[PDB]
From a paper:
Since its identification, [name] has been mainly known for its role in accelerating the generation of the anticoagulant activated protein C (APC) and favoring its cytoprotective properties. Structurally, [name] shares a notable degree of homology with the CD1 family of receptors, including the presence of a central and extended hydrophobic cavity suitable for lipid antigens, flanked by two alpha helices lying on top of a beta sheet. The presence of a lipid bound to [name] is key for its biological functions.
For this, we performed a wide crystallization screen and obtained [name] crystals in varied conditions, which ultimately led to solution of the structure in three different space groups. Crystals grown in other conditions yielded [name] structures in two novel space groups, C2221 and [name], containing 2 and 4 molecules of [name] per asymmetric unit, respectively. Structural alignment against [name] in space group P3121 yielded root mean square deviations of 0.459 and 0.400 for [name] molecules in space groups C2221 and [name]. [name] in P3121 and [name] space groups present strong and continuous Fobs-Fcalc difference maps that suggest a prevalent diacyl molecule but a more ambiguous head group moiety. Fitting of a diacyl phospholipid scaffold (lacking the outermost head group) satisfied the overall shape of the map, albeit with some degree of uncertainty for the orientation of the carbonyl groups. In order to assess the later, we mapped the atomic displacement parameters (ADPs, also known as B-factors) in all space groups in which [name] was crystallized. The P3121 space group yield the highest B-factors for all atoms, while those [name]-lipid complexes present in the [name] crystal structure showed the most rigid atom positions, as suggested by the lower B-factor values. Amongst all [name] molecules in the three space groups obtained, the dimensions of the pockets range from ~ 1280 to ~ 1615 Å3, where both values were found in two of the four [name] molecules present in the [name] space group asymmetric unit.
Numbering used by the authors: 8 to 105, 108 to 177
């Protein structure tokens, strides 16, 4: 298939300080690397697939995503008390056959599947059998707002797909 996969590992020492490590692969080729603390994260395209204006917008959007991602983790901790240190893994992307696209967004915590995005209804589901205040609250937050439902679905089904179509 024609695919863009994105992987984000987030190392939280505490609610306020996170180290990001991640990357993206297009057609099985490493294309982007993400690394560093939340206050000065480095994001590069390894090959200049996007021109500067397009790349600047993409970088701005990624940074906005990280701000939202970190804000959500802080909120869950604030309301339900997370155990630190912890690592979060987000694995997401889109896959185009040789019109329709398969998209996915899976979240794991400390290496165990936690929640994932079901794009059919733009809803997050529990990926664990373990019941907890944390999973219920996180799902409630993720499912309460357009930004984490339909806006994320647009990113996967439109932004990601058009990126694969333009650059593969
Ligand atoms: C494409 C071009 C190439 C990309 C290069 C990538 C570099 C490598 C790293 C990959 C990082 C993934 C980035 C995803 C960006 C998604 C994005 O921009 O979404 C925007 C809004 O989504 C949101 O705001 C959704 C927030 C989702 C958070 C999910 C995490 C759930 C778990 C958090 C709490 C866990 C608590 C228990 C520990 C809309 O983007 P737009 O610009 O189209 O608008
Ligand atoms: C994620 O895993 C880390 C260990 O890698 C957990 O941290 C441990 O938490 C227990 C209980 O609070 C402490 O006794 C240990 O000292 C901690 N380890 C370290 C290295 O500090 C953390 O609680 C886990 N977080 C989850 C499961 O959400
Ligand atoms: C990212 O930032 C790291 C931390 O910055 C340091 O701490 C802050 C609080 C300020 O005192 C600042 O002046 C310090 O430099 C750096 O250690 C690291 O090198 C930075 N990464 C890059 C790529 O610049």
């Amino acid at each position: 298939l024609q695919r863009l996969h994105m992987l984000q590992i987030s190392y939280f020492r505490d609610p306020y300080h996170v180290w990001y490590q991640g990357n993206a692969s297009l057609g099985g080729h490493l294309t982007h690397v993400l690394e560093g603390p939340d206050t000065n994260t480095t994001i590069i395209q390894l090959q200049p697939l996007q021109e500067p204006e397009s790349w600047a917008r993409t970088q701005s959007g990624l940074q906005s995503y990280l701000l939202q991602f970190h804000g959500l983790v802080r909120l869950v901790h604030q309301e339900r008390t997370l155990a630190f240190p912890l690592t979060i893994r987000c694995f997401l992307g889109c896959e185009l056959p040789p019109s329709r696209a398969h998209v996915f967004f899976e979240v794991a915590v400390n290496g165990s599947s936690f929640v994932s995005f079901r794009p059919e209804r733009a809803l997050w589901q529990a990926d664990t059998q373990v019941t907890s205040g944390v999973v219920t609250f996180t799902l409630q937050q993720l499912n309460a707002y357009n930004r984490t439902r339909y806006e994320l679905r647009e990113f996967l089904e439109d932004t990601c797909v058009q990126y694969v179509q333009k650059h593969i």
